[PDB]
Amino acid sequence: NLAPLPPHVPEHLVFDFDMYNPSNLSAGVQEAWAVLQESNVPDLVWTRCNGGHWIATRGQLIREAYEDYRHFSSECPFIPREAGEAYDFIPTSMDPPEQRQFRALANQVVGMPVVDKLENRIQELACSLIESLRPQGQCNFTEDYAEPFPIRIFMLLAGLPEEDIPHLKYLTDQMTRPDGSMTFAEAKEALYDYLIPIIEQRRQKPGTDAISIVANGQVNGRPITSDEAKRMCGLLLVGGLETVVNFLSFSMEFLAKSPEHRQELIERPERIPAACEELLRRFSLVADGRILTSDYEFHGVQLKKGDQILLPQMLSGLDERENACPMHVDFSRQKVSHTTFGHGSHLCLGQHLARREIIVTLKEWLTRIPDFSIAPGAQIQHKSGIVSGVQALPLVWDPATTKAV
């Protein structure tokens, strides 16, 4: 239901958008969010859903807010408030100056030098999974590739057993698209419960895995504490288990529905890096926010200290004012503008791993399975949250049109 309208919010700014169950979700989750950018809607609106919060609907305001960390703090970055308050991951729950020291440590496990390290294991696993699917002429892409590929890469990088994936995937699901079986705080508690003994073991007997690197690392000189290491590893788990996993399904659903864009990439494989970028814009999928540190007049709207503001990273690139014809996918876009990996001091540290996983998937899938479609009669359902997603993606192809390499 709807929270009572606070006294300082004018009535002409009310627009009751539900980020966990938007009205037009049946048309596609990105399209459902894009109703916030129709001609009747102001640049900054208030929704009474999920406890009541502001929403910035346009790339210009979203970028400005993410840059101004003095007014828009990441101390409480999730809606609803009880989730944002419980949220204490590092570095995301910190503002500069304190935040920055932890980014260098995190960069040690997912930074560009490390991604070049994993280059061939990433390639090897993608090829292995796709060739296993190729003769079947069908798959459930979410379960058969979108989950195993990024998650098994992350679990190897973190030195965690693959048998733990269903448990951990359940918990990160509850932090991003809750089904109501757990609050965010309970899921976060359960994630830390998993991590605490592992952190302890790898500070006594350190190794070469990402948890060992974070847990034995230094933070601008001084040792990291066990608690900080846990709060960093929690974040890396969510990123490894929820981001590329869900993005790959949006991308493959689009290609399965658009033979012309497929053929363009088969005909012209060197455009695949650019296509990755244009797909990251069109099927952007993260939406978090900030909390006001003081009363502040922002673009002619009076924001109050403690107000939460959703700053949908998803919406910047779908904004017609940043990209003409924003809902159309054009691999030859001159200037692809988006904030899919965030903006400001919290720019995604995993984005280099993410791009490699996406580009390797596209190259290696189209090589072996150039021609595929949605299974006949299937209605693809999307789900909305902090990270939006695809419920299921049944694909079909003629094994005779395929190639083993």
Ligand X SMILES: CC1(C)[C@H]2CC(=O)[C@]1(C)C[C@H]2O
- Could you list the residues known to form a binding site for heme, using ranges: 348
| Residue with smaller CB distance to ligand HEM, 59 or 350 | 350
Count Cβ atoms within 10 A of the Cβ of residue 161 and give its class: 0-12 exposed, 13-18 middle, 19 or more buried. exposed
Q: Which stretch binds ligand X (CB under 6 A): 31-39, 47-55, 234-242, 326-334?
A: 234-242
**Binding-site string for ligand X from residue 274 to residue 293, where x marks contact by CB under 6 A and - marks none:** ------------x-x-----
- Is the distance from CB of 224 to CB of 214 less than 8 angstroms? yes
Angle, CA of 391, 262 and 257, to the nearest 5° = 40
- Is the distance from CB of 386 to CB of 286 less than 8 angstroms? yes
As measured in angstroms, the least distance from the Cβ of 288 to K ion is 12
Within 10 Å of residue 6's Cβ, how many Cβ atoms?
A: 11
Any bridge partners for residue 53, and if so which?
47
- Select the residue interacting with ligand HEM from 63, 134, 202, 346 (CB under 6 A): 346
Contacts of 140 (CB under 8 A, 6+ apart): 392, 393, 394, 395
| Residue with smaller CB distance to ligand X, 9 or 286 | 286
Q: Which stretch binds ligand HEM (CB under 6 A): 38-46, 140-148, 222-230, 350-358?
A: 350-358
**DSSP symbols for 33-62:** HGGGGSTTS-SEEEE-GGG-EEEE-SHHHH
Tell me the residue nearest to ligand X as measured from the CB: 239
**Binding-site string for ligand HEM from residue 133 to residue 172, where x marks contact by CB under 6 A and - marks none:** ----------------------------------------
As measured in angstroms, the least distance from the Cβ of 181 to K ion is 22
Instruction: Select the binding partner of residue 354 from ligand HEM, ligand X, K ion, none (C-beta < 5 to 8 A, by kind).
Output: ligand HEM
As measured in angstroms, the least distance from the Cβ of 169 to ligand HEM is 14
Instruction: Select the binding partner of residue 386 from K ion, ligand HEM, ligand X, none (C-beta < 5 to 8 A, by kind).
Output: ligand X
- Residue 58 to residue 337: CA distance in whole angstroms: 13
- Residue 202 to residue 345: CA distance in whole angstroms: 30
Residues interacting with ligand X, by CB under 6 A? Answer: 89, 92, 176, 235, 238-239, 243, 286, 288, 386-387
